[PDB]
Amino acid sequence: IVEGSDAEIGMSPWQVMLFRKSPQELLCGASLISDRWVLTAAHCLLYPPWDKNFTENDLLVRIGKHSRTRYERNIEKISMLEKIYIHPRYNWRENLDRDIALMKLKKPVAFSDYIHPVCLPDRETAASLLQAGYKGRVTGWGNLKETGQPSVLQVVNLPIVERPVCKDSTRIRITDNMFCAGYKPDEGKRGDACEGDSGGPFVMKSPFNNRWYQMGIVSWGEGCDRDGKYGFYTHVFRLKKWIQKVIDQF
């Protein structure tokens, strides 16, 4: 996260770290959606242009964390993966359309002050809150600038951007399964996700029921925090029928 701040303890209790077993390293962010299910970006698990195609046994998830690098004894919980599910129409070839994946844990994780699931949006909350200018919140342990790494989880609040502005910022083909967020060059404030934040959540706090909803997944950007560029996020509500189908079946 570029131009963010340190998270408060328990601020993002749904945040998950995707962790490579060997070598031991941060791969991506992720989020806890129930005691057995974790949501992330498909490209965190499958990206053939970079020879990336992880299997369940390659990975762990670390839940309840605050520190990036330290083993948070008696606080974090480390879970093995039973199964990965990638959206069947995830487009790794072109533009990361439908950049979403689910991971089922081998055993349920115990909730605590530090570990608690986020809500997935219903149609009405999504329609009400996914509006240009409305801000969400992005969290992660990724790099602090494009060109270094944080001691603890970082947080930044960023406004959703009008779709024509998103499209006009890039040569990449933008789809209805994406939205973009960030400040404009003339807005003064700044901030973005960066490398290592992918897969983590873009959340909004509903003013109707005071619950946090995950509206987006950190998906892609051209650099980090560049003027005139924006971060692109997977539109979770648009893909929720797939999420529900996977959870219902498996």
Partner: peptide, 12 residues
């Protein structure tokens, strides 16, 4: 080397 070693139980 950047990350503190995690307990071996999670790697077995």
């Amino acid at each position: 080397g950047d990350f503190e070693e995690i307990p071996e139980e999670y790697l077995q």
